[PDB]
Structure 1
Amino acid sequence: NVIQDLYLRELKDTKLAPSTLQDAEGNVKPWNPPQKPNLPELELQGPEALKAYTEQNVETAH
């Protein structure tokens, strides 16, 4: 009755048309791609270490 009038009028005349994905993006955290932090190269590598170790490990303190 009142259900029908309201139903008809409301449903028919209401047209969705929301924000684009581009507009949406601002209101969200955007996609993150791979991070790719490389491979760090550590100490105790190179002949800096070797000469150091021969010499250093010739005398140590108590």
Structure 2
Amino acid sequence: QDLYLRELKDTKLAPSTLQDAEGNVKPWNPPQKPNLPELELQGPEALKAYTEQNVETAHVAKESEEGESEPIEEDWLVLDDAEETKESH
């Protein structure tokens, strides 16, 4: 079917210069190469944050400590205030 065959061959061929052989695109005056594989190759990381979100920041946990390892001047005040709270108990 020369209807079918010639329509389908032009259907394959006129984008075959756009996809198979990298001859840019004869009918399009803007180019096709510096849009998706060059400019928006950083597209999703122009859609997300670069260098913290996509590099993902393997970050060390900020180390919190115990109560500064001082169990004298605070525990005896706790025991005196506990005398006070038991006088309230």
Question: What TM-score do you get using the length of structure 2 for normalisation?
Answer: 0.14
After the TM superposition, list the runs of 4 or more consecutive aligned residues in structure 1 that deviate by more than 4 angstroms.
16-62
Q: What per-residue deviation string (whole Å, max 9, x for no partner) do you get for residues 3-48 of structure 1?
A: x010110001114999999999999999999999999999999999
Gaps of 5+ in 2: 60-89
Q: Structure 1 residues 55, 46: CA separation in 2 closer, same or farther (over 3 Å shift)?
A: same
- C-alpha root-mean-square deviation of aligned residues, in Å? 18.0
Residue identity over aligned pairs, in percent, reads: 100
> Which residue is 1:17 aligned to?
14
Aligned residue pairs total: 59
User: What TM-score comes out, normalization by structure 1 length?
Assistant: 0.18
